[PDB]
Amino acid sequence: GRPRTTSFAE
Amino acid sequence: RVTMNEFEYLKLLGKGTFGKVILVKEKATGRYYAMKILKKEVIVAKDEVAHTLTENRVLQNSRHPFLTALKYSFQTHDRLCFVMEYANGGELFFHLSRERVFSEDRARFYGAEIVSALDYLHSEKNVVYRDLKLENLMLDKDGHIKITDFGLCKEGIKDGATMKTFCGTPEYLAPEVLEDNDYGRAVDWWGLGVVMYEMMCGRLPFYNQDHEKLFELILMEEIRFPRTLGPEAKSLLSGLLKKDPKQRLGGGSEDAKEIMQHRFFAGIVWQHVYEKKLSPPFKPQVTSETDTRYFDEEFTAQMITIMECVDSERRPHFPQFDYSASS
Ligand SMILES: CCOCCN(C[C@@H](O)CN1CCC[C@@]2(CC(=O)c3cc(O)ccc3O2)C1)S(=O)(=O)c1c(C)cccc1C
């Protein structure tokens, strides 16, 4: 299904 | 005192930018763990020092049935190690990528366990989690939820106090986080709405590979549902996915208690949820202590692992990496 998602902070 | 030599390194469970998670056996005891191993130099280069320390802090400061338990954290000259309990069932992402949709009953079970833990974090710990997603939800040997990855957590958030860091995962961001104008603990209930929508509907509530188009949809587009979704689930997800946090189910002074009382959870005894008295509808079907079938082959089939007072800029000595949970 949907691709893996990546966490972030800015 | 705990070093890397105290463990045997068995299977790679996952690999990313900052390091890896390895299924390990503690030599002395014969107990199995998942060891998350992060490179100090990559942590520093990408400014993830404060988030690593929060992960550590929240792990050490939490005890809850549906929060990943930390046994040890220690460090070497170039690595930070978190030895966590091994959640045999893998990520909910693993399961949902394959089954496509969960039944409403099964999603209710997972939602109830997520709420119990977020309720605990908000109410007892004054913590906001901020990164709810399918990747950060794991299943244990019995089929119970384990929330992982507490590095984007916010500490010291009581009741209605606010946060300002733009962070999380693009697909899951709450509208007020994207508004970039302060937000409260109700961002966790948005995240809860997203993951439960994914479980019951088979897709993200909003998607586009172009982030600018993605952010546009999360901000502007009314929530729609597949027409097979039942009325009490449609009611829950509409409440959780209200774009205005003041309108959101869980957005007021009652917090989780509002969600707990919704008709979708009608016969849920919330204390039994806490006590793990609810039987999981899926039990992981592992055949040994080292069966990793609920982890991608891409990782499991690979190879694993590749000065005690050195404190440098590229490889800082990290405080509070001397932890061993008391019995
Ligand atoms: C300071 C920022 O740290 C951020 C570190 N990253 C985030 C990861 O921790 C995400 N994380 C989400 C839950 C599952 C997983 C992988 C796993 O098999 C696993 C098994 C467990 O019993 C317990 C935790 C686990 O962590 C990875 S990551 O992207 O580097 C990464 C990725 C994406 C995949 C595998 C390992 C790692 C380490």
Residue-range domain boundaries for chain B: 1-90+286-321, 91-285
Please check whether the two domains, B1-90+286-321 and B91-285, share a CATH topology.
Answer: no
B130 reaches A (C-beta below 8 A): no
The technique by which this structure was obtained is X-ray
DSSP B158: -
Which residues, including other chains, have CB under 8 Å from residue B82's CB and lie 6 or more apart?
A: B35, B36, B55, B56, B59, B70, B72, B73
- Rounded Cα distance between B23 and B84, Å, is 10
Declared resolution, Å: 2.3
- Rounded Cα distance between B148 and B142, Å, is 17
Please work out, in degrees rounded to the nearest 5, the angle formed at the alpha carbon of residue B300 by the alpha carbons of B297 and B304.
145
Q: Is B233 exposed, middle or buried (0-12, 13-18, 19+ CB in 10 A)?
A: buried
- Rounded Cα distance between B30 and B7, Å, is 9
- CATH class belonging to B1-90+286-321: alpha beta
The superfamily (CATH) of domain B91-285 is Transferase(Phosphotransferase) domain 1 (1.10.510.10)
* Interchain pair A10, B167: CB under 8 A: yes
Of A1, A5, A10, Cβ closest to residue B169: A5
Two structure tokens written together for B238: 């509409």
Burial state string for B258-269 with b = 16 or more CB within 10 A and e = fewer than 16: bbbebebbeebe
Looking at this protein, which amino acid is placed at residue B275? E
- Taking each helix axis from N to C end, the angle separating B104-125 and B187-201, rounded to the nearest 10 degrees, works out to 170
- Rounded Cα distance between B78 and B327, Å, is 29
Q: Provide the 3-class DSSP secondary structure of residue B197.
A: helix
- Rounded Cα distance between B13 and B34, Å, is 8
- Rounded Cα distance between B24 and B12, Å, is 9
Strand partners, B311: none
Q: Which atom of ligand 1 is nearest to the CA of B86?
A: 22
- Please state whether B156 falls in left (phi above 0), alpha (psi between -120 and 50) or beta: left
Looking at this protein, which amino acid is placed at residue B82? F
List of chain A residues whose C-beta atoms are within 8 Å of the C-beta of residue B171: 2, 5
B212-216: long-range contacts at Cβ-Cβ below 8 A with a sequence spacing of 24 or more? B214/B170, B214/B171, B215/B170, B215/B173, B215/B178
DSSP string, B58-120: HHHH---TTBPPEEEEEE-SSEEEEEEE--TTEEHHHHHHHH----HHHHHHHHHHHHHHHHH
Mutate to test the pocket of ligand 1, among A5, A6, A7 (most ligand atoms within 8 A of CB): A7
- Which phi and psi angles does B299 have, rounded to 5°? -95, -55
Is there a contact between B109 and B285 (Cβ–Cβ < 8 Å)? Answer: no
Report the residue of B53, B97, B154, B163 to disrupt the A interface, i.e. the one with the largest count of A CBs within 10 Å. Answer: B97
Looking at this protein, which amino acid is placed at residue B196? M
Tokens 């900052």 locate to: B18
Q: Provide the 3-class DSSP secondary structure of residue A9.
A: strand
Tokens 């990747």 locate to: B135
- Rounded Cα distance between B38 and B43, Å, is 7
Is there a contact between B150 and B60 (Cβ–Cβ < 8 Å)? Answer: no
